[PDB]
């Protein structure tokens, strides 16, 4: 069976986030579900289990009042939401289905997570939305780079010469900023005899902003 | 059996039968006693079915 | 509560290495122990269920059990799939729920040392006419990752609002660090020059370029 | 009756002046993955008095050494679960029995 | 619950083998190896049932 | 007596191998031993005669000798482009004639398994016109071979003269095989589901084709 779920994106703290899991193939009336979280570089955490055919629920000893429950049997999905999100809650969520069926407290011993659902990383933070800003750069074989700034949200796609240039490309991982925005750089390697004879074009595309910006890099003497 | 559990800590004792203490409470007449040596990576599949 | 496990355990390929998983009175010993492994950037999967058996698709290579208040896992042959992390799981009654381990990292016991190559790029005239200037200097093609970038304005290092990321694995099993520093352009105009001397392994390199060039 | 049931779970006295009601329920509480919610007690220190429910999560000691929080090598957990699956025949289906 | 001992070479196909080790006839008895260099997963366990 | 030879030999390229021919006192030593080699789909050719002088037409690559009961034909290395059986011949006084050995296959030394594909070809109405009904299924795109094909009607196998052809070599570095089965039209329509299975020493697929279209 396959366990697709729909993730979320960056959001302001203290709001409500909606994440749901989809059940396919197997009949969704006989198997309990389990929800876990995984912080980066940290072990997993348990909260509770939800029966699909009943309104039975249970929560852990630490997360009781900040979590609710919603069921959609006709849609054949499960609905969960988080209230009063914290800063240290940027964890990926897995839709794990446990084999068998249990509702009592003592039935948890013989339960193992058979299959797991793929998850999307949801980080709660607030930053301005808008198109990416590209910062021009000059070259220092001498190489040149292309800098993009304050893009929101992730991710961005970088293209050189509108896709004509494929060799020599090199991307860089995203960074964190004190203002809440994100920055990225793209540096390519060119021969030393083609700095002024041939002029290259740096482009970026951001599908949430639905806009495209172009420039013309020029080396300086 | 009193003199049974003084031969180092064991490896696996999952059972589908009776307790060792009720083996003293129920008197038997025939038990099979056979032994062999297997590599530790190949003991986990010793199970019924 | 949590289960105490070693942070890392490594061994050469061709032999067997062991992983321990301690526990309390209620955490393990009165219950059953399960183990989960997860690929990097993927979903975890079942490894050992009912303390002895393995599900379909898992060969006889994987092996794990428990003796007293602790559990042990053993693998034999680290070629392509045992470089992932492993987790120890059980159930207790104090938290009335599943308690999991911290995390065990298993590696193998191999790349040549690569000298760092920092390339400083001065701003273009389009940045000067737009009253924007960001101090940028990046270090790439180095192994192992031990770089430490410094924002030295030829007399002293500068540390104020420094944004520094972590090295990541590229397609060539290398690292690529990055660091940015955004200020007003007038202090760059007042600066005589700029250099980012990275200190990796002790082989400090200098790449000084003029702001005007 | 002597066996796994009516000797450690629910023993019925010699005089009862009543009877049970049993019927087949292989869809209301039987699931394809196995309904583990229903479970029985396997090991007890002694016999059970008639009409006496006994609930205990403690481990029954099964050796010389007193098992306080360790089990698996000498002492067992007294509770075992049911593998209630609809793939069986008639001798393993869950029967809803009310007295 | 039955024991078997043999020394004749097993034939995996239609190859006629009566004492020769062909490429389809393999010896059915393979020995172990027990050294302290081996870890927990490659050590002999005295399994008694 | 009959001269015997090993049925096959395995020698990797880059190092020398040899083939032994066990015999008797009256056939080997007191009589010369000749080694015949034959190309597949062509004519045979003598390799060595009188055990110490070489024929004209071959470079100084091979070696042959006799030593008492057995004679050894030393092959200095092996090329993967030529794999040729070697025959052993001698002469005996009691039977007063030429007696020949069994012959030995030579092969190079491994490649990973592939994914086999099997197809089922039910007969048309023109074949059922002839008061007869035959079924053929073909297996291809598998490497290596040594496969066995058996028919199955999804409820019970049938043995009405089941035959399986030998695997063959193609020109695109792949093997192929086929199976045949001929029945009566009355028993042909008695079942509405026919299939054949293959044994790829670890891989087994079923081709469920209904006899309707």
Best interface-test mutation with E: which of B5, B35, B40, B43 has the largest number of E CBs within 10 A? B40
Cβ of B44 within 8 Å of Cβ of C67? The answer is: no
Handedness of CA A160, A162, A167, A171 (dihedral sign): positive
> Tokens representing F205?
């697929």
Side-by-side strand order, sheet with C85-91: C44-48, C34-38, C85-91, C98-100
Chains F and D touch (3+ CB pairs under 8 A): no
Mutation site for C-interface testing, chosen from E41, E42, E45 by largest number of C Cβ within 10 Å: E41
- Say which residues have a Cβ less than 8 Å from residue F74's Cβ, sequence separation at least 6: F16, F17, F18, F62, F63, F64, F65
CA dist A164 and C25 (Å) reads: 65
Task: Tell me the CA distances in angstroms from D21 to A139, C41, D99, F82, F131, one per residue in order.
Answer: 89, 55, 6, 82, 63
Name the β-bridge partners of C64.
C73
CA distances to A16, A60, A91, C1 from A66, rounded to whole Å, are: 11, 11, 16, 21
Chain A interface, best mutation among C50, C126, C145, C211, by max A CB count within 10 A = C126
For D35: left if phi > 0, alpha if psi spans -120 to 50, otherwise beta; the answer is beta
Query: Closest by alpha carbon to D96, among D16, D30, D10?
Result: D30
- Residue pointed to by tokens 């302001």: A12
The CA R_g of chain A, rounded to the nearest whole Å, is 24
CA distance A176 to chain C (A): 6
Q: Which residues of A84-96 are buried (b: 16+ CB within 10 A; e: fewer)?
A: ebeeebbbbbbbb
Q: Can you say how many angstroms the Cα of residue A92 is from the centroid of all Cα atoms in its chain?
A: 8
What is the Cα–Cα distance from C88 to C33, expressed in whole angstroms?
A: 7
The answer, for A176 touching chain C at a CB cutoff of 8 Å, is yes
Peptide bond into A153 cis (omega under 30): yes
What is the separation of C-alpha A221 from the centre of its chain, rounded to a whole number of angstroms?
Answer: 43
Strands (E), chain F: 8-10, 17-21, 34-38, 44-48, 62-67, 70-75, 85-92, 97-100, 105-107, 117-121, 133-142, 149-152, 163-164, 168-169, 175-183, 195-198
- Verify cis geometry, omega within 30 degrees of 0, for the bond prior to A205: no
Å between C15 CA and nearest CA of chain A = 28
Residues C96, A74: Cα–Cα separation, whole Å: 31
Which residues does D66 contact at the CB level (< 8 Å), separation at least 6? none
Beta bridge partners of F151: F196
Q: Method of determination? A: cryo-EM
Q: Say yes or no for a CB contact (<8 Å) between E22 and F10.
A: no
Q: Which candidate, C117, C127, C213, places its Cα nearest to that of C174?
A: C117
Query: Which run of H or E residues covers position E25?
Result: strand E25-26
Q: Could you give the CA distance from residue C99 to residue C115 in angstroms, rounded to a whole number?
A: 44
Smallest Cβ distance to C63: which of B9, B10, B44?
B44
> What's the distance, CA A15 to chain centroid?
18
First-to-last CA distance in chain A?
62
User: E23 vs F8: CB contact, 8 Å cut-off?
Assistant: yes
Q: How far is CA C177 from the centre of its chain?
A: 13
Instruction: Cis check for the bond before D62: say yes or no (omega within 30 of 0).
Output: no
Breaks (C-N over 2.5 A) in chain E follow: none
Residue with tokens 């999991």: C100
Answer yes or no: do B43 and E47 touch at CB < 8 A. yes
Helices H / strands E in chain F, number of each = 2, 16
H/E segment holding residue C128: helix C125-129
Nearest to C102 among A43, A48, A137 (CB): A43
Tally Cβ neighbours within 10 Å of residue F135.
19
Taking residue A108's Cβ as centre, other Cβ atoms within 10 Å add up to 20
Tokens of A82: 């988080």
What is the distance between the alpha carbons of residues C15 and C8, in angstroms, rounded to a whole number? 17
Task: Give the DSSP letter of residue C79.
Answer: S
Contacts of C154 (CB under 8 A, 6+ apart): C191, C192, C193, C194, C195
Query: What is the distance, to the nearest Å, from the Cα of residue F66 to the centroid of all Cα atoms in its chain?
Result: 29
Beta bridge partners of F140: F117, F176
* CA F95 to centroid of chain Cα atoms: 31
Q: Do A177 and C163 touch (CB under 8 A)?
A: yes
The Cα–Cα gap between C163 and A185 comes to 14
Max Cα-Cα span within chain D:
45
Cβ–Cβ gap E13/F10 under 8 Å: no
Residues of D in contact with A102 (CB under 8 A): 36-37
Nearest residue to A129 via CA among A185, A181, A204: A181
Instruction: Sort out which chain B residues have CB atoms less than 8 A from E40's CB and list them.
Output: 40
Distance from C-alpha of F18 to C-alpha of F11, rounded to nearest angstrom: 9
Q: CA-to-CA distance for C18 and C9, rounded, in angstroms?
A: 8
CA atoms within 13 A on the CB side of C157: 11
> What's A107's DSSP letter?
G
C49 vs B: CB within 8 A: no
Q: What angle do CA F169, F175, F180 make, to 5 degrees?
A: 100
Selecting from D64, D73, D76 the residue whose C-beta is nearest the C-beta of B19 gives: D76
From CA F8, how far away is CA D25, in angstroms rounded? Answer: 65
Task: Give the tokens for residue B4.
Answer: 């049974």
Tell which residue, A60, D2, F65, has the closest CA to residue B26: D2
Residues 177-216 of A with CB under 8 A from D: none
Q: Which two tokens stand for residue A14?
A: 């203290």
Q: By three-state DSSP, how is residue C91 classified?
A: strand
Of chain D, the end-to-end C-alpha distance in Å amounts to 15
Given a contact cutoff of 8 angstroms between Cβ atoms, the answer to whether F51 and F107 are in contact is no
The answer to whether residue B40 neighbours chain C at the CB level (below 8 Å) is: yes
F146–E22 C-beta distance less than 8 A: no
Contact D71 C93 (CB under 8 A): no
What CA–CA distances, in Å, run from A140 to C150, C208, C210, F166? Answer: 19, 9, 9, 69
Minimal-distance CA residue of chain B relative to D65: B5
Q: Tell me how far CA of residue F21 lies from CA of A96, F7, F105, in angstroms.
A: 66, 11, 13
Q: C126: which chain A residues are within 8 Å (Cβ-Cβ)?
A: 136, 215
Q: Do the chains contact at E48 and B37, CB–CB below 8 Å?
A: no
Query: Is B13's Cβ below 8 Å from some Cβ in E?
Result: no
Neighbours of B7 (CB within 10 A): 8
Contact status of B11 with chain E (Cβ, < 8 Å):
yes
Asked if A165 and A202 count as a contact pair (C-beta separation under 8 A), the reply is no
Q: Is C203 in contact with C162 (CB distance < 8 Å)?
A: no
The CA angle F119-A1-F197, to the nearest 5 degrees, is: 20
In the numeric block, which tokens belong to residue C178?
Answer: 């990055």
Size of interface A-D (CB pairs under 8 A): 34
CB contacts, 8 Å: B22 with chain D: 43
Cβ within 8 Å of C, A 117-146: 117-119, 135-140, 143-145
């Amino acid at each position: 069976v396959q366990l697709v779920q729909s993730g979320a994106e960056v959001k302001k703290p203290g709001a409500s986030v909606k994440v749901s899991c989809k059940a396919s193939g197997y009949i969704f009336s006989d198997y309990n579900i389990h929800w876990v979280r995984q912080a980066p570089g940290q072990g997993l955490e348990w909260m509770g289990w939800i029966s699909p055919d009943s309104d039975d629920t249970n929560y852990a000893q630490s997360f009781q009042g900040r979590v609710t429950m919603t069921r959609d049997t006709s849609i054949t999905t499960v609905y969960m939401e988080l209230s009063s999100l914290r800063s240290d809650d940027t964890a990926v969520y897995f839709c794990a289905r446990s084999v068998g069926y249990c509702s009592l407290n003592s039935c948890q011993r013989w339960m193992w997570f058979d299959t797991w659902g793929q998850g999307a990383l949801v980080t709660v933070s607030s930053a301005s939305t808008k198109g990416p800003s590209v910062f021009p750069l000059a070259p220092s074989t001498a190489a040149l780079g292309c800098l993009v700034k304050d893009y929101f949200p992730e991710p961005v796609t970088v293209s050189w010469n509108s896709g004509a240039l494929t060799s020599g490309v090199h991307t860089f991982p995203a960074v964190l900023q004190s203002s809440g925005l994100y920055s990225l750089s793209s540096v390519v390697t060119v021969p030393s005899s083609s700095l002024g004879t041939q002029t290259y074009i740096c482009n970026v595309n951001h599908k949430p902003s639905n806009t495209k910006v172009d420039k013309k890099v020029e080396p300086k003497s | 059996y009193s003199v049974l559990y003084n031969f180092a800590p064991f490896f696996a004792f999952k059972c589908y039968g009776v307790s060792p203490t009720k083996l003293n409470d129920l008197c038997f007449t025939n038990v099979y006693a056979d032994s062999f040596v297997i590599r530790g990576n190949e003991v986990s599949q010793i199970a019924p079915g | 509560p949590v289960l105490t496990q070693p942070p890392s355990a490594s061994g050469p390929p061709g032999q067997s290495v062991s992983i321990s998983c301690s526990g309390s009175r209620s955490n393990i010993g009165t219950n059953f122990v399960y183990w989960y492994q997860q690929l990097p950037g993927a979903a975890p999967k079942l490894l050992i269920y009912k303390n002895d058996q393995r599900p379909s698709g898992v060969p006889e290579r994987f092996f794990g059990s428990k003796s007293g208040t602790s559990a042990s896992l053993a693998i034999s042959g680290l070629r392509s799939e045992d470089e992932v992390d492993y987790y120890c799981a059980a159930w207790d009654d104090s938290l009335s729920g599943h308690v999991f381990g911290a995390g065990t990292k298993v590696t193998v016991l191999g790349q040549p040392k690569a000298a760092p190559s920092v390339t400083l790029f001065p701003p273009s005239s389009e940045e000067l006419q737009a009253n924007k200037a960001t101090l940028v200097c990046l270090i790439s093609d180095f192994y192992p990752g031990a770089v430490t970038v410094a924002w030295k304005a030829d007399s002293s290092p500068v540390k104020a609002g420094v944004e520094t990321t972590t090295p990541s694995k590229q397609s060539n099993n290398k690292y690529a660090a990055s660091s940015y520093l955004s200020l007003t352009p007038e202090q760059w105009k007042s600066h005589r020059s700029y250099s980012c001397q990275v200190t990796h392994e002790g082989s400090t390199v200098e790449k000084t370029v003029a702001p005007t060039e | 009756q002597t066996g796994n049931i009516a000797d450690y779970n629910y023993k019925l006295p010699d005089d009862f002046t009543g009877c049970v009601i049993a019927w087949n329920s292989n869809k209301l509480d039987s699931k394809v993955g196995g309904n583990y919610n229903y479970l029985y007690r396997l090991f007890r220190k002694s016999n059970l008095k008639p009409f006496e429910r006994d609930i205990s999560t403690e481990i029954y000691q099964a050796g010389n050494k007193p098992c306080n929080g360790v089990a698996g090598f000498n002492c067992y957990f007294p509770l075992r679960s049911y593998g209630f699956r609809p793939t069986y025949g008639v001798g393993h289906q869950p029967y809803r029995v009310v007295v």
